[model samples]
Target: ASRLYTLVLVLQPQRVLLGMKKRGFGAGRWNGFGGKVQEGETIEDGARRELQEESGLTVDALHKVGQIVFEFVGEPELMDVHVFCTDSIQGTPVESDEMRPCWFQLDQIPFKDMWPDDSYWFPLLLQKKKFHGYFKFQGQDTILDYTLREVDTV
Candidate 1:
C-alpha cells in the first residue's frame, strides 16, 4: 500500500555489515543494504541493486523481516521502509566513495550517527522477529511518540 522499498542485508552475531547511507538523516550512518524504489523497479530489485552498488554483496534471498512507516506533519511524503534480512549472499563487502561498508557490533553500533529512531527497532530486527512501527519525531532533539506491533509472534 505505502511506498514500497526493500532492504537486503546480512547479519552476524554482535555485528551487521552495512553501508553508510548517502542521503537524508542516514547520510553518514552505517545502514543495512538498501535504497529507494526506482521507477518501474521491483522492491526486490531496488534492494539487490543497492546492496551490490553499496557493499558489493550479491544477495540470493532477502528475508522479509518487517516494515515501518515514518510520517511527519510537515513533510510531503511518508517513508515506507521495508526491512529485510539475509544470510544468503556472495562477494565481499567494500567501501566506496559514496558509502563506507563496515560492521558494527551490537553494543558498539553508532546510534548517534543514524536516524533517531533506529536504536529502537534495530535491536528487534537483529533478533529476527518481524515488527511494524510508527515514528513521529521533531528534528533530532525530540521524540513525540511511537507504537510497535509484532508481526509474527516468535
Candidate 2:
C-alpha cells in the first residue's frame, strides 16, 4: 500500500522555515510542515492546512515543486509525497504539539538532524528547480539507494 502526503517549505529571502517534529513519524527530526492528505481535500489544500496546524503560518500560495517516493526495506507501505514551496505566507510561526518551528539559513540547513533523503533533493529546492526522486531506505537514517533529478517541470 502507498499513502499520499504533502510537505511544504516556506522559502524566505535567505532562509527557509522548518519544523522540528516532536511526535509521530518523523519525531526528533527537522522537516518541512506536512502530513497525510485527508479524504476529499486536494493535495495543495492538505499542505496548506498542515502547515498552519504545525507552524501557525498560513500559506497564500504554493508551488508544486517536486514529488518523491519513499520505500522502506521491511515496510509494506510506501510514502508518495508531494513537495510544495512558497515564499508568501502569513502569521508568526508558533509551536504546536506536533512541531517546533524554526528558521535556518540556506547554508546552515540542519540536514544532519533530518531524514537522510532530504539532503539529496533539498538543494534543488533551494536552487528553485523542480525535481523528482525515489529513495529506498534501510531505515529512517540510512538510505540504501536513491536517485534525484531536476526537471523542467514537476
Candidate that scores best on lDDT: 2
Deviation from native of the Cα of residue 136 in model 1, angstroms: 1.4
Tell me the tens digit of each residue's lDDT in model 1 across 23-113: 6655766677776889988776787787787788888877677787877757767778787787688888877767778877777878787
Q: What TM-scores do the predictions have?
A: 0.85, 0.96
Error of 2 at 106 (Å): 1.0
- The clash numbers for all candidates, in the given order, read 0, 0
**Model 2 bad stretches (over 4 Å):** none
- The C-alpha local distance difference test score for the whole of candidate 1 amounts to 0.76
Q: Model 2's lDDT to the true fold?
A: 0.91
* Per-residue lDDT of model 2, residues 15-128, tens digit only: 998999887888999999888999999998999998888889888988899999999999998999999998699999998777888899999999999998888898889988
- Worst 10-residue lDDT window for candidate 1 reads 1-10
